[PDB]
Structures are given as structure tokens and as C-alpha cells.
Amino acid sequence: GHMPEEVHHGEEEVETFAFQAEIAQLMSLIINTFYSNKEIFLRELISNASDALDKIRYESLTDPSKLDSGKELKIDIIPNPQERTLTLVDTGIGMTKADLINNLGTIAKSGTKAFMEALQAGADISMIGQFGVGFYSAYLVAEKVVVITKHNDDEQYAWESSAGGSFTVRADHGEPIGRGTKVILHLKEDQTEYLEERRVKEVVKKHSQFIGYPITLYL
């Protein structure tokens, strides 16, 4: 019948960080400018998943136990019309917390910087992947992006950013993906075409027709 009052927790559960300025500049650039072919975002995500799937499979031959979390190497695409989300799940190698904060918030600095310099000298947005930072093209279509990831050597973590100059990371006790990465795009009001059946088939067939892993569409 008492009333305790927990004045201190084990660890801070929600950490907030600022992107390196160059990453923020590119993100502000992406989320605001016009691009005629915004469908390429899905190509960049599928491209990242192929790489994550490749990396766990390379390690799969030297150590067969690294598929403890799942033996199927696949990509799943789930539009959710009533939540305005599109999610891509892969069972690739995933990311540790250290990698997640570092890769998305910090060491992307060089690629984003070189890419912006490239843009002013006449490159276009579709070259973003040749600068290793294709992930940020998600903001062509999303007002908010969430990344859930699970690496064999770490726990599951959730990353989030609405492109306001900062991102958050927290331990995700939500649904366990056993290994890999889940990207959740909260789409802008005008990009709801990517919640429809035909259009998503159209984009995968147009851009990722030669991926060496199965892509499954869930409606």
C-alpha cells in the first residue's frame, strides 16, 4: 500500500544526438528539394540489404552458427496504408549499437560532404549510392524514418530521426527480429503512392531486378 519513487534508472533509456553538420545539410537538402524520380529510395534500401545479406552469408561459411537467428536470407516489404508506413525488413548481418550511432550519425560525414560537393558540380540525387550514403534518400518520401537493428553480438536497438538535425537511439524491447535490420518509413502526405500494390511491384521490377535474394511483398 506504500508509494515508492524510483529516482534513478540503470542506464539512460533514450539517447539524443546531433548529426555531423554535413549529414544534417544533406538531410535538409533531401527532404526539401524536388526530384523527378523519388522511387530510387527503395533501390537504395534494397541495395543496403543485399550488402547486409552478403556480409552475414560470407561469415556463414566460416562459422555456420552465425545463422542462429535465422537461416533464411530474405527481404520483406510491407506497406501499411492505415499507418502511412512502408517497412523493409532484411535478415542480413544487422548492426551493433556502436555501428548504428556511428554509421548513421557520424562517419557518414565524408560521403555526405563529397556528395554535396558533387551535387553543386552537376551530379543528381540518383548518384547518392556511389557516395555510400544512399540511406538518406529515404527522406525523399518519408517525413520520419525509424531503423530497428539486431546484430549477433548485441541487443536490439531502435534509431529514429525526423531530419531536424538530431536522432535518437534506444534499446528496442519491441518485436524481436532475430537478426538484421528493419527500416520504417513514415511517408509524407504526397508520397502515398508507395503504399499501393502495383506501384511497389513496379519499383522493385524497375530497380532491383537482379538482387540475389528473394523480395516478398505483404499486403
Ligand SMILES: CC(C)c1cc(C(=O)N2Cc3ccccc3C2)c(O)c(CO)c1O
Ligand atoms: C540504415 C541503413 C544504413 C541500412 C543498414 C543496414 C545494415 O544493417 N547493414 C549492415 C551492413 C554490413 C555491411 C554492408 C552493408 C550493411 C548494411 C541494412 O540492412 C539496411 C537495409 O535497408 C539499411 O537500410
